[PDB]
Amino acid sequence: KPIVGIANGYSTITPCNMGINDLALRAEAGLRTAGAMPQLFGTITISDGISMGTEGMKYSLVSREVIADSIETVCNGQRMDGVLAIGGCDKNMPGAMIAMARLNIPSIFVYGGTIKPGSCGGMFTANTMSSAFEAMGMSLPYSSTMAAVDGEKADSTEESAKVLVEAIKKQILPSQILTRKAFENAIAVIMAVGGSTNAVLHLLAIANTIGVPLSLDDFETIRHKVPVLCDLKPSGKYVTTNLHAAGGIPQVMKILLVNGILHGDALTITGQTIAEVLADIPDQPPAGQDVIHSWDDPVYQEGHLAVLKGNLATEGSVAKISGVKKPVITGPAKVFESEEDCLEAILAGKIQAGDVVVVRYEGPKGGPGMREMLAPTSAIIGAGLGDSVGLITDGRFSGGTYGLVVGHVAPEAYVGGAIALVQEGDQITIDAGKRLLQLNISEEELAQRRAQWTPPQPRYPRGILAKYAKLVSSSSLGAVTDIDLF
């Protein structure tokens, strides 16, 4: 008599999560007929209620940690034999996967599904992560690109429940599926579909949670070996429903397998390996569609998620180099200690062509919460400066500019990264061709500035933001909150 949890994602009623509840009954149905006793339970979410530009956004990554905590607390508390998480299209559903890695009890992830023709039609965070989850064998094939309102998604939910019951009887564990090879498989797929830069953070967090080595260097290494195969929004032309119709993630994965990238011997939740699961998929995408390009006529010849390093980011940083015409700039620094201070200066006309705008103390501890910042890139585009200024931050930017936009600068300013030592007027070089992010001062003036730097006082001495800032690690570790505590 297995006791199986159903972690029902998106349990914050709003007109946007009607469908997710329809799948929970299907999962509970499939669990009972497969011989399990389901225990349904809900987890929080804040996507579509969060106000972009204010501090609500600082709670977004925080809610990823709260979701992981809830599932781990319930599943351990209820001594469950397995758990099925239904993640809706919310930016913090990677929290369920972090919990599965922590629990290491048999698990399967059911994506709530995509919407048909905004943020859940293109390859933003949720769709990138759900596809990544399928690429790692934690979701059934085709399941990550099904539409939410479609019947095959309900059928896939029941089937996931059945497979999970088999996985409990066979003890197929997350630690056996979420291997280094599965993560390498997920990075390749994320490059091949033009996925979100947020997936870098979430994949690092899952790997550092389960105990397999993964670093930003591995993203950059795989980036050069894997072309962008899919022409997908936001950067590209099609939406997830077109990708699904053209063969979905299995077709993408099979192209990567036959062309030497994918690890075919990695295991999936059904007990079959990747190569076995893809055995009947054609080696090339169908004719008559250009959603999925062929290996020899890709959308781009290498991946789009570049890692820049240098004295300004000794641990690394992430820049999407997709629609960037000139991927180099050297300019004078304009520095801000918050998103607000930066937006204020842009609107006041204080940023000119040629500037390198630095938004610091927005990192995991500095924010706290490493919030996504949309206002700075949008305001830069409105000022007509998109193609003539660079943007760097220890936080995250959403939206592009047609210029160089760099996030995840690590070490962050709060812990004394060199980004905290930038002074107004310093020259900064952002050079994608050199994969270089550099502060153009002497090594010894940098050390003399470092000797005078003093740690700031926390913005929030108490509350959950304080608890988060106290525990959270660097973004180059995925901003996990449970490592190196003792």
Curated annotation (Swiss-Prot):
Domain of life: Bacteria
Positions of post-translational N6-carboxylysine modification: 91
Cofactor(s) in the UniProt record: [2Fe-2S] cluster; Mg(2+)
Record's keyword terms, sorted: 2Fe-2S, Amino-acid biosynthesis, Branched-chain amino acid biosynthesis, Iron, Iron-sulfur, Lyase, Magnesium, Metal-binding
Signal peptide: none
Active site: 398
GO terms assigned for molecular function: 2 iron, 2 sulfur cluster binding; dihydroxy-acid dehydratase activity; magnesium ion binding
Pathway noted in the entry: Amino-acid biosynthesis; L-isoleucine biosynthesis; L-isoleucine from 2-oxobutanoate: step 3/4; Amino-acid biosynthesis; L-valine biosynthesis; L-valine from pyruvate: step 3/4
SUPFAM superfamilies: IlvD/EDD N-terminal domain-like, LeuD/IlvD-like
Binding site for Mg(2+): 48, 90-91, 372
A single BP term in Gene Ontology: branched-chain amino acid biosynthetic process
Description of how the protein assembles with itself and partners: Homodimer.
HAMAP family: IlvD
Similarity-based family: Belongs to the IlvD/Edd family.
NCBIfam families reported for this sequence: ilvD, PRK00911.1
Protein known as: Dihydroxy-acid dehydratase
Origin species: Synechocystis sp. (strain ATCC 27184 / PCC 6803 / Kazusa)
